[PDB]
Amino acid sequence: LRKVAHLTGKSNSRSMPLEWEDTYGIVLLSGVKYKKGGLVINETGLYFVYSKVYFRGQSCNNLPLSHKVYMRNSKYPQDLVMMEGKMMSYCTTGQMWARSSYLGAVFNLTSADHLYVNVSELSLVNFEESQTFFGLYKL
Amino acid sequence: LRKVAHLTGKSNSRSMPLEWEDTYGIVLLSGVKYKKGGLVINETGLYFVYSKVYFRGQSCNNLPLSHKVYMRNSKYPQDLVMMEGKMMSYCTTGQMWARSSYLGAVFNLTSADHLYVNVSELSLVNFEESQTFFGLYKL
Amino acid sequence: LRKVAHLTGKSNSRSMPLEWEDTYGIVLLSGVKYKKGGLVINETGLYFVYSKVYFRGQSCNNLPLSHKVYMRNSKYPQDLVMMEGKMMSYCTTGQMWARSSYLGAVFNLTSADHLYVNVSELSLVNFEESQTFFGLYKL
Amino acid sequence: TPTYPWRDAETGERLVCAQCPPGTFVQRPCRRDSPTTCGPCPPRHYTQFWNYLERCRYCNVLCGEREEEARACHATHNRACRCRTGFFAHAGFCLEHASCPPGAGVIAPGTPSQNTQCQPCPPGTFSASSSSSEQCQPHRNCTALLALNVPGSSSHDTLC
Amino acid sequence: TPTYPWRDAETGERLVCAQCPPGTFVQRPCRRDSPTTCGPCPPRHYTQFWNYLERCRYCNVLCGEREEEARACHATHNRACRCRTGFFAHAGFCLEHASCPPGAGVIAPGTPSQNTQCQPCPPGTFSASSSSSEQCQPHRNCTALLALNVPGSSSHDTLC
Amino acid sequence: TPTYPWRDAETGERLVCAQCPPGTFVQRPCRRDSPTTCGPCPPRHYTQFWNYLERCRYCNVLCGEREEEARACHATHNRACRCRTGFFAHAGFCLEHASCPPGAGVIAPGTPSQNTQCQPCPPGTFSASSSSSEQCQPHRNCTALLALNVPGSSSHDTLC
Ligand SMILES: [Mg+2]
Ligand SMILES: [Mg+2]
Ligand SMILES: [Mg+2]
């Protein structure tokens, strides 16, 4: 059975990193764990990892938006950024706006690595399941 | 032989959902069918699904652009959205503009599921094979 | 052992196509070669190919930005574009700005194919390893 | 009662099965000797139509902070939202109802589907406020009781 | 005649093969006893140069609605497009030729590669129209026949 | 000295291993009969903290063209950058220090973390230049030596 995860936005998020829905809707989680915003790798190897986050707001002020996927484990007391995108000057001041950020690539990960997603502006995030998500699979 | 599809934009599209080119150019279709805009799954399982659509126009008026990948089968008379992106306030009024939307993730799909792509503004879509496409593969 | 590559931005790039980092940092290269900006395929078959490039600038003038993944081999003296995105009217004139372009899809590639990434405006590219990258894997 | 085609997994035989009603899903397909068996939607899930699904759908509509529940999640339908009082729906957002400035009055208040509508105050009426409710009111008839110090405008009452 | 290196798949022997000409592809590589065998491009595909491709390339250039075919798809080349009459090419788009407003006249019309060029009308000439073709014309010499009621401007003829 | 938990790969036995210090990594875990063995960071890599990594981290911070090295890559830390002279850091960019226009003078020059600060010249002082260094200077006292032709402004000295 294939190690795989696809999780969807969780509205609850009060803090960083984001939390994700792991049980309901169009989600998958098999041979990989979810713990406090984090996907926990249990088998060392190559995985393709991806995330999309959907940002939007009533009235643009071009607050920089940042989206990062990062790794943490016990062996070092500091995170490693695996992928990241930043948006600046993305809308016309004062208008309703919306834009997503997409990240996906391959990484060698180790057992007990924990992966997380971070964002600059939690309040601009929209959490619909089809719009905002975080997933991976073992190659 | 690997179940796989990569289809390219079809200029013809007069309606929703989009139609796709399945025979010519840099395309693939193997163990998966194409029928009226739709990729038809024939083997239940996990697939990574992706689509890109390239939007552009002479004179921006910031018409909302929406891009969705969705599923339909006979078991329920209503579609399910698997992924979606929306763009609003993406260009400066009156300028030539261009932007793409990218979607990709993993889904568990069933035999006889039909997958489609939808867009808000058919007339802003550009159909070059390298710019606009829709594909999947079985993990 | 899985054929795979994930390379990161190289600051050095003085010319097109871009060059990539193949040894240091969060990179992978196995059963695929890197030669002068190019990933060299050594086993015919299906690969998922992807690239992200991160663009940014102090003072927007909406110079068109283009990002392409392309293939070259000895059998024809002209390149083939596999995927491409263009951005126009993406920022507000005179502001600090940033935006990425993401491309990923499946292709059938042949032994001795060389893959490259191209961009319109080399000087607007940022080369941080987590922001700008180019990779593939054999399905 | 609607039906669906189904091949027995035991035999391959071609059967006509009855579908399950809203609020249920297919728990066991029909076979030669028994009909379809439907089960009840579990919490947080739903089926709104006759179906032959093998599990219910999740109630995946959630109400943002400027919205309220117009209908609840229920075994027979997803949740649905609308804009809370004070807001109206526009291109997926819930926007604040506009205010009509001084000189203009409300001819229709905001609803969940429409913004406030304003007219410039017609002759003999005024509105002194930026207000999403205040309507144009007639000027006081000073003479009808003092004499006028200053005639009213569309934004100020008549002064005595 | 250009050539290419090829290892026999039967033996591994190192051969020099002849390439195929525009309008053809490699159908069968050369081997010790026979030369390369080329076949003809099928419909909708092309090879523009000497090659050793194993199939032809698709004519993947298509003409949008403001474009027309400047060259057809053909076994020896892809299709090519240009802007239809009235439009010019700019940063991948086909833009409408500008009009020169009143007071200005056309000194070069639009082509497929250039926009309309305008000058402000020089003394003694006018243009009364917003027009992508109209040039500055000399004022009528009223005196040359009445006397002038109003001298001409750059946008209006001389009145008699 | 910090420690970490480790199961022997030979036995599965539960051991407490000592971690490696900044500038080193774990080359061989501890086992029942020997302690952790650390090796030294190779070139271009680093470990800044006690760790149990199995290889060092790459110095992946690089200095763009408007930046300079504030600290070097070293076995015990990554490189760090700041803005070169003339620039300041803002939202990830290195921006040019502003100039104060005529009529305004510098009250704090630019640093790597701050932009130039300007005041409008106070009475009796001027600045005639757009300058990121020039401060407001007092007007010459003409009378203190001629008599005044023109009183000074905030942008021009007093003329004699
Ligand atoms: Mg009012
Ligand atoms: Mg004219
Ligand atoms: Mg000054």
Coordinates of C-alpha atoms in Angstrom, one line a residue, chain E residues 5-149:
Chain E
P5 CA 26.1 7.9 -36.3
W6 CA 24.1 4.8 -35.5
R7 CA 24.8 1.5 -33.8
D8 CA 23.1 -1.5 -35.4
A9 CA 20.5 -2.8 -32.9
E10 CA 21.1 -6.3 -34.4
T11 CA 25.0 -6.2 -34.2
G12 CA 26.1 -3.0 -32.2
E13 CA 28.4 -2.2 -35.2
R14 CA 29.2 1.5 -35.7
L15 CA 27.6 2.9 -38.9
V16 CA 27.4 6.2 -40.7
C17 CA 23.8 6.7 -41.9
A18 CA 22.4 9.3 -44.3
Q19 CA 19.8 11.6 -42.9
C20 CA 16.4 12.3 -44.4
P21 CA 15.5 15.4 -46.3
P22 CA 12.9 18.0 -45.4
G23 CA 9.4 16.5 -45.9
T24 CA 10.6 13.1 -44.7
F25 CA 11.5 11.2 -41.6
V26 CA 13.5 8.1 -40.7
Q27 CA 11.4 5.1 -41.2
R28 CA 14.2 2.5 -41.0
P29 CA 17.7 3.2 -40.0
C30 CA 20.6 2.2 -42.2
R31 CA 22.3 -1.2 -41.5
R32 CA 25.4 -2.8 -43.0
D33 CA 23.7 -3.8 -46.3
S34 CA 21.2 -0.9 -46.8
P35 CA 20.9 2.8 -46.4
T36 CA 18.6 4.9 -44.4
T37 CA 15.0 4.6 -45.5
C38 CA 13.0 7.8 -45.3
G39 CA 9.2 8.0 -45.4
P40 CA 7.0 11.0 -46.2
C41 CA 5.5 13.3 -43.7
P42 CA 1.9 12.3 -42.9
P43 CA -0.8 14.9 -43.0
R44 CA -0.5 17.8 -40.5
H45 CA 3.1 17.1 -39.8
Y46 CA 6.4 18.3 -41.2
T47 CA 10.1 18.3 -41.2
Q48 CA 11.8 21.5 -42.3
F49 CA 15.4 20.4 -42.1
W50 CA 17.6 17.4 -42.8
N51 CA 16.9 15.1 -39.8
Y52 CA 17.0 11.7 -38.3
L53 CA 13.7 11.9 -36.5
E54 CA 11.7 8.8 -36.2
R55 CA 8.4 10.6 -36.7
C56 CA 7.5 14.0 -38.2
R57 CA 6.6 17.0 -36.1
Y58 CA 3.1 18.3 -35.7
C59 CA 2.1 21.6 -37.2
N60 CA 1.4 23.1 -33.9
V61 CA 1.1 26.7 -34.9
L62 CA -2.6 27.7 -35.2
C63 CA -4.0 31.0 -36.3
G64 CA -6.1 32.9 -33.7
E65 CA -9.1 34.9 -34.7
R66 CA -7.1 38.2 -35.5
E67 CA -4.6 36.3 -37.5
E68 CA -4.4 34.7 -41.0
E69 CA -2.2 32.1 -42.5
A70 CA 1.0 33.6 -44.0
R71 CA 2.1 30.1 -44.7
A72 CA 0.3 26.8 -44.8
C73 CA 1.1 23.6 -43.0
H74 CA 3.1 21.5 -45.4
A75 CA 5.3 18.5 -45.3
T76 CA 8.3 20.8 -45.4
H77 CA 7.3 23.5 -42.9
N78 CA 5.0 24.4 -40.1
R79 CA 2.2 26.9 -40.5
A80 CA 2.9 30.6 -39.9
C81 CA 0.6 33.3 -39.1
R82 CA 0.4 37.1 -39.3
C83 CA -2.1 39.6 -38.2
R84 CA -5.1 40.1 -40.6
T85 CA -5.6 43.4 -42.3
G86 CA -6.3 46.2 -39.8
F87 CA -4.0 44.7 -37.1
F88 CA -0.4 44.7 -36.1
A89 CA 1.8 42.4 -34.1
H90 CA 2.9 43.5 -30.6
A91 CA 4.3 41.3 -27.8
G92 CA 2.5 38.3 -29.1
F93 CA -0.9 40.0 -29.7
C94 CA -2.6 41.4 -32.8
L95 CA -3.6 45.0 -32.0
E96 CA -5.9 47.3 -33.9
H97 CA -4.2 49.9 -36.0
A98 CA -4.5 53.3 -34.3
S99 CA -6.5 56.2 -35.6
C100 CA -5.0 59.7 -35.8
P101 CA -7.3 62.2 -34.2
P102 CA -8.5 65.4 -35.6
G103 CA -5.6 67.8 -35.8
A104 CA -3.3 64.9 -36.8
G105 CA -2.8 63.0 -40.0
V106 CA -1.4 59.7 -41.2
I107 CA 2.2 59.7 -42.4
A108 CA 2.4 55.9 -42.6
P109 CA -0.4 53.5 -42.4
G110 CA -0.4 50.4 -40.4
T111 CA 1.1 47.2 -41.5
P112 CA 1.3 43.8 -40.0
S113 CA 4.5 44.7 -38.2
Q114 CA 3.9 48.5 -37.4
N115 CA 1.2 50.8 -36.0
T116 CA -0.2 53.8 -37.8
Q117 CA 2.1 56.8 -37.6
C118 CA 0.7 60.3 -37.1
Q119 CA 2.0 63.8 -37.4
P120 CA 0.3 67.0 -36.1
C121 CA -0.9 68.7 -39.2
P122 CA 1.6 71.2 -40.5
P123 CA 0.7 74.8 -41.2
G124 CA -1.8 75.2 -44.1
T125 CA -3.1 71.6 -43.7
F126 CA -5.8 69.9 -41.7
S127 CA -7.4 66.7 -40.7
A128 CA -10.9 66.8 -39.3
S129 CA -11.2 63.0 -38.7
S130 CA -10.2 60.3 -36.3
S131 CA -8.9 58.0 -39.0
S132 CA -6.3 55.3 -39.5
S133 CA -6.0 56.3 -43.2
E134 CA -6.8 60.1 -43.6
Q135 CA -3.8 62.3 -44.4
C136 CA -3.3 66.0 -43.7
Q137 CA -4.7 67.9 -46.6
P138 CA -4.1 71.5 -47.6
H139 CA -6.7 74.1 -46.6
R140 CA -8.8 75.5 -49.5
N141 CA -7.4 78.8 -50.9
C142 CA -10.6 80.8 -50.4
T143 CA -8.9 84.0 -51.8
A144 CA -7.6 81.9 -54.8
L145 CA -11.3 81.9 -55.9
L146 CA -14.8 84.4 -51.9
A147 CA -12.6 85.9 -49.1
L148 CA -12.0 84.0 -45.9
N149 CA -14.6 83.9 -43.2

